[PDB]
Amino acid sequence: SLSTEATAKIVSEFGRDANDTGSTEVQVALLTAQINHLQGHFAEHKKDHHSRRGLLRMVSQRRKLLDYLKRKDVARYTRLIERLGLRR
Amino acid sequence: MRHYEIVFMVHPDQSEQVPGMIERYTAAITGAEGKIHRLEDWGRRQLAYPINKLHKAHYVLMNVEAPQEVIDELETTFRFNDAVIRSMVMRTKHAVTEAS
Amino acid sequence: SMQDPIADMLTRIRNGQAANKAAVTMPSSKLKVAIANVLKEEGFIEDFKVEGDTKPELELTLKYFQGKAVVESIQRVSRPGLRIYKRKDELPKVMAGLGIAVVSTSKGVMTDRAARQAGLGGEIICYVA
């Protein structure tokens, strides 16, 4: 649902260059933008459950990517979890 | 911002205020950053079933391109107005402007 | 394959033999090539050949005496879930010596006869027969 322009902005603003779509920082930033917006969605309706499932996939996959960063490179991970505001 | 297709019937009883209503709504949309890509009228055709105790209706379809939001107040007015009993608003899935 | 690529290669061999296929292929590893060496030097296959640089592919060539495949069984023994290691005095005879066990010794991957000769055991890869 998240617009193409927003994905381009995020890929730029967390990517190591332009069109590095697939690095963990890029992946996590897209997932966190989507989490925030959907949490906007489900605030108003709490009784959508088939869509909320896709949101649990987003959250779970984002935890898995963040755990991969922490294991691989701690420095980029710690820069990210606040440079994007995470592990609150 | 993607295509719509407004269709609304103005009854012969309601045919009194056709231009006023059409132009007021077109002005509202244009001020709402919405530009008409096409417009046509299908006259006053015949109604298969006597809807609302009547057999005639002047079918005007206006089909503008509009943002997400500016359409809600239009249907709000349609519900609050007796000019048209049913104005149904449409989508595109694509880019079409020509009429037929 | 996903977790045991060596049972993948044996499954391919026995499935292609029961399918009367002339050659099977699979993504190569260096231990796949080692076991393939053992087999083709024991006369269980004709040949193999690894092509590709970033994606090598191991090209086993199956072997039929007439219309019957040379391998009757080929079973994975040590798997992820049971690793099997034998001391050289307890290396297994497979079908009373008529079939091999390929073991992984610390001097490489050899047959069972070769290992009990050179006096060193190791991890039992499979039973061929």
Binding site: - | M9, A48, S100 | -
Partner: protein, 50 residues
């Protein structure tokens, strides 16, 4: 390719009472069937047909 507004190719897909003809006797490819039926339903509720 085909939509609701052209009432021409709808009367052939309908009866007098307004029942959509099954594709079992027309030949429709089962994608044009869904779109076609949506067209008749829109038109009925837009009141070209009962």
């Amino acid at each position: 390719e085909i939509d609701y507004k052209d009432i021409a190719t709808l009367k052939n897909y309908i009866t007098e009472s307004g029942k959509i003809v099954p594709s079992r006797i027309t030949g429709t490819r089962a994608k044009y069937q869904r779109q076609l039926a949506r067209a008749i339903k829109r038109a009925r509720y837009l009141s070209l047909l009962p």
